[PDB]
Design an enzyme around this catalytic site. Structure first.
Site, PDB file in Angstrom:
ATOM      1  N   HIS A   2       4.108  12.419 -53.981  1.00  0.00           N
ATOM      2  CA  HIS A   2       5.282  11.849 -54.634  1.00  0.00           C
ATOM      3  C   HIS A   2       6.572  12.605 -54.406  1.00  0.00           C
ATOM      4  O   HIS A   2       7.551  12.370 -55.111  1.00  0.00           O
ATOM      5  CB  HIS A   2       5.066  11.757 -56.136  1.00  0.00           C
ATOM      6  CG  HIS A   2       4.067  10.729 -56.533  1.00  0.00           C
ATOM      7  ND1 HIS A   2       4.188   9.408 -56.175  1.00  0.00           N
ATOM      8  CD2 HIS A   2       2.922  10.825 -57.245  1.00  0.00           C
ATOM      9  CE1 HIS A   2       3.157   8.732 -56.646  1.00  0.00           C
ATOM     10  NE2 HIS A   2       2.374   9.568 -57.300  1.00  0.00           N
TER      11      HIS A   2
ATOM     12  N   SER B 269      -1.933   7.074 -54.161  1.00  0.00           N
ATOM     13  CA  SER B 269      -1.346   7.007 -55.487  1.00  0.00           C
ATOM     14  C   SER B 269      -0.049   6.232 -55.406  1.00  0.00           C
ATOM     15  O   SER B 269       0.949   6.727 -54.902  1.00  0.00           O
ATOM     16  CB  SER B 269      -1.086   8.410 -56.000  1.00  0.00           C
ATOM     17  OG  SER B 269      -0.337   8.377 -57.190  1.00  0.00           O
TER      18      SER B 269
ATOM     19  N   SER C 131       3.359   4.071 -56.619  1.00  0.00           N
ATOM     20  CA  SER C 131       4.493   4.267 -57.515  1.00  0.00           C
ATOM     21  C   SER C 131       5.055   2.871 -57.787  1.00  0.00           C
ATOM     22  O   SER C 131       5.440   2.148 -56.869  1.00  0.00           O
ATOM     23  CB  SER C 131       5.553   5.128 -56.855  1.00  0.00           C
ATOM     24  OG  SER C 131       6.523   5.522 -57.800  1.00  0.00           O
TER      25      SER C 131
ATOM     26  N   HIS D 110       6.985   3.234 -53.959  1.00  0.00           N
ATOM     27  CA  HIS D 110       6.445   3.792 -52.722  1.00  0.00           C
ATOM     28  C   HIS D 110       4.945   4.018 -52.843  1.00  0.00           C
ATOM     29  O   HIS D 110       4.325   3.603 -53.817  1.00  0.00           O
ATOM     30  CB  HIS D 110       7.112   5.137 -52.398  1.00  0.00           C
ATOM     31  CG  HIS D 110       6.854   6.211 -53.416  1.00  0.00           C
ATOM     32  ND1 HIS D 110       7.563   6.309 -54.596  1.00  0.00           N
ATOM     33  CD2 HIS D 110       5.980   7.246 -53.419  1.00  0.00           C
ATOM     34  CE1 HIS D 110       7.139   7.359 -55.280  1.00  0.00           C
ATOM     35  NE2 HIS D 110       6.181   7.945 -54.588  1.00  0.00           N
TER      36      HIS D 110
ATOM     37  N   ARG E 248      -4.893   8.710 -59.387  1.00  0.00           N
ATOM     38  CA  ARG E 248      -5.054   8.633 -60.842  1.00  0.00           C
ATOM     39  C   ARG E 248      -5.951   7.459 -61.194  1.00  0.00           C
ATOM     40  O   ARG E 248      -6.833   7.568 -62.042  1.00  0.00           O
ATOM     41  CB  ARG E 248      -3.724   8.434 -61.540  1.00  0.00           C
ATOM     42  CG  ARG E 248      -2.986   9.694 -61.824  1.00  0.00           C
ATOM     43  CD  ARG E 248      -1.702   9.378 -62.540  1.00  0.00           C
ATOM     44  NE  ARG E 248      -1.904   9.132 -63.958  1.00  0.00           N
ATOM     45  CZ  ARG E 248      -0.952   8.688 -64.768  1.00  0.00           C
ATOM     46  NH1 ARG E 248       0.256   8.431 -64.289  1.00  0.00           N
ATOM     47  NH2 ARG E 248      -1.194   8.538 -66.060  1.00  0.00           N
ATOM     48  N   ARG E 249      -5.681   6.329 -60.544  1.00  0.00           N
ATOM     49  CA  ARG E 249      -6.446   5.110 -60.727  1.00  0.00           C
ATOM     50  C   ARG E 249      -7.678   5.380 -59.890  1.00  0.00           C
ATOM     51  O   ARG E 249      -7.606   6.138 -58.940  1.00  0.00           O
ATOM     52  CB  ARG E 249      -5.678   3.907 -60.170  1.00  0.00           C
ATOM     53  CG  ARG E 249      -4.279   3.744 -60.703  1.00  0.00           C
ATOM     54  CD  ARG E 249      -3.616   2.563 -60.035  1.00  0.00           C
ATOM     55  NE  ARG E 249      -2.175   2.741 -59.863  1.00  0.00           N
ATOM     56  CZ  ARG E 249      -1.244   2.333 -60.718  1.00  0.00           C
ATOM     57  NH1 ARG E 249      -1.582   1.700 -61.832  1.00  0.00           N
ATOM     58  NH2 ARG E 249       0.032   2.578 -60.464  1.00  0.00           N
TER      59      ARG E 249
END
Lengths: 210, 217
Positions: free
Chosen positions: B45, B114, B116, B127, B135-136
């Protein structure tokens, strides 16, 4: 910045007697040590002899295994580690309640959360976990602050040590390469989150991130 | 040197519809995805460290699937050198597959996707990020040299699915960081609760066994 590229003291156990070393060779009974104990045995990253960052200040076995203090000096390694911690959400979160932020110490305390011996006595090493069991690395600016982090320790063996205490041919690529290898050391937290209970040390009073 | 720093591909689920996020703000259902449907592809990120972009977004039966592409001459350069000094990268891939330092290091350092997006209380899809664990759940990150090859690694993916995906994907270097920037990130990963375990789950889930790809989990 100057209060970052100053020596870092690391302390802990290289062996744990009351701990049956479930693994092979690593076994290490007090029996040898005293006898086994001149040169400048250094402190390196996971053993790489091209990643040394200082010396093994001093050693001294005590009622519960072998204990040593190091002194990260490499004005180059520390320099990497600093800007490294520049971008590490674990580092930016900081230590606990009364403890004060120390970017360079917190980082080392988290990426290399443990010591590992190798041997007279070849060298000591900072790594992400320890071969043996209960060799949690404890970093600090002051060596004694460190020493009193381990409940066991009496006063003597402590003052035993206190009557004792840029070799860096590597880079960010060296460090980048060793990290992948560590990201797969199976359940590293247990072996770790076990060692801090073994010698008392905890996040409430130390920089230990485990 | 040239075989290595060539374009790299990465595919994988961003979200799995048949899974319950471990936190409400992670809820991302079909009709939402579908509704919302060139996004940048960065690392952990980090808005400064953008190694490439996403080439495909596809809402398949199991969830939101995307195929990316690492193109940064600078980032692929740092990676190339770091795979040299890795123990895992010299050990090699799974027997039938050919050694690929770059794809291995990458497939071990950033083994998860991951996404966003906006808070699911013209750009809802901010993005996509490469990181050590998503996380998921079910977000393993299959990295390859062939974009087709990375799809064929996902059992659930249909042919009609890969097609719709193909049509899509068929200032110079975006990177704005450096190697020391990438450094402090691996620490953070070493303390994600159940990192290797979370991954092994993602594998057996999406189906991407390792004995047929580059994953490391």
């Amino acid at each position: 910045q100057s209060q970052a590229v100053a020596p870092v003291y690391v302390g802990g156990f290289l062996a744990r007697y009351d701990q049956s070393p479930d693994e092979a060779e690593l076994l290490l009974p007090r029996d040898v040590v005293e006898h086994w104990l001149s040169v400048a045995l250094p402190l390196n990253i996971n053993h790489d002899d091209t990643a040394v960052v200082g010396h093994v200040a001093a050693m001294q076995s005590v009622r519960d295994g072998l204990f040593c203090l190091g002194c990260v000096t490499s004005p180059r390694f520390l320099e990497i580690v600093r800007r490294a911690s520049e971008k590490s959400e674990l580092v930016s979160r900081g230590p606990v309640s009364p403890l004060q932020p120390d970017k360079v110490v917190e980082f080392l305390s988290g990426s290399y959360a443990g010591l590992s011996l190798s041997s007279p006595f070849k060298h000591v090493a900072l790594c992400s976990v320890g071969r043996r069991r209960g060799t949690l690395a404890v970093y600090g600016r002051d060596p004694e602050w460190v020493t009193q982090r381990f409940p066991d320790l009496t006063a003597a063996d402590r003052d035993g040590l206190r009557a004792q205490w840029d070799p860096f041919r590597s880079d960010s690529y060296g460090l980048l390469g060793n990290y992948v290898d560590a990201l797969y050391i199976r359940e590293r937290l247990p072996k770790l989150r076990y060692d801090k209970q073994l010698v008392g040390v905890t996040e409430r009073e130390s920089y230990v991130k485990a």
